[PDB]
């Protein structure tokens, strides 16, 4: 019941159109204000510039690209606490009951990780006592609950 949230992993992300700022060789580094926001994806590179693309020198000119990142679909990762595991146990007696009255006759026992003896009492037949324990050692080691939509 209510595992602690640990991580979100994005498996579907949509992108806006890229935005470019560029400069000629030996004229400084190009800048965009999008480059300071933490939710944008940016790259810092250099480009081959010369007379053929509007620069007085042939060499590397600074170029910057940025695109806004927005996650469309993510997978949630929940940490489990092995001491908070619950379970439910059905208990019933073979008396004479027609199938249509099975649910009425069933005793539904709830256990915690540190519950005491849970007894199901049947009117006219006494009561049985259950001392139970989960087995979550091999099945529930270091694990997250990962869920998609």
């Amino acid at each position, epitope marked *: 019941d209510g595992p602690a949230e640990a991580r979100k992993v994005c498996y579907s992300a*949509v992108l806006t159109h890229v*935005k470019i700022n560029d400069k000629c060789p030996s004229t400084g580094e*190009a800048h965009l204000a999008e480059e300071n926001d933490g939710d944008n994806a940016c790259k810092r590179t250099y480009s081959d510039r010369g007379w053929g693309n509007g620069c007085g020198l042939f060499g590397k000119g600074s170029i910057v690209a940025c695109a*806004k990142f927005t996650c469309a679909k993510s997978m949630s990762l929940f940490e489990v606490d092995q001491t908070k595991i619950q379970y439910v146990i059905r208990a019933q007696l073979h008396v004479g009951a027609k199938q249509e009255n099975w649910n009425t006759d069933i005793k539904t026992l709830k256990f915690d990780a540190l519950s005491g003896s849970q007894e199901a009492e049947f009117t006219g037949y006494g009561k049985a006592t259950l001392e139970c324990q989960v087995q979550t050692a091999v099945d529930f080691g270091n694990s997250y609950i990962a869920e998609m939509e």
Partner: antibody
Amino acid sequence: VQLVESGGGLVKPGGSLRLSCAASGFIFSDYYMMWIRQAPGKGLEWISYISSSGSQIYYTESVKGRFTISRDNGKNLLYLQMNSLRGEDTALYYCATETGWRIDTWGQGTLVTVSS
Amino acid sequence: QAVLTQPASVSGSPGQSITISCTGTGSNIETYNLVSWYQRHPGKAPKLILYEVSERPSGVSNRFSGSKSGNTASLTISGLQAEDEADYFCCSYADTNIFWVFGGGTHLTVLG
């Protein structure tokens, strides 16, 4: 931080007009600029879009072969060279900055009326 | 075929709360979740009052709030005042093709 539009006026169909936008208050060469217009009784619409250095140009289909956006980063000026004007071009025209994939700062607007 | 719809005119008095809706087509306002709201008084420059659905630029009052659930983005203005009577415009970045699309505009009238 302010933008001032100019160049709007009256002209006949098939005519020419050249809009200007004077930018102050920020580094003009670092920001994408765009031209937006609103026709009477019509929704707002961006018609031109230029990158911070002018290497990326974008137009709508309504104006592609007719309008030419340019910018002079030296004199902080954005131009909208409008040619072959039509009746559908009668609108109030804005120059606006663009940052964070939103239209950020506007101008008062300049009125362009095309009437036969 | 990709244009936002919003009511032509919505009215209120001083004091109450009003909401202007902006309905787009399941892509328009639903894809990127960046919807901006603009305020324009007659003759003046439009002013960015909201962007990114619920974000608020520096200097904008708490009275202006934004929400978005599916097709619809909403601008909600509480504590209506005489300064608030103006034109309000919706904006959304549709996709990589047409980039930005606006709404038809809504004239807020305050029953001063």
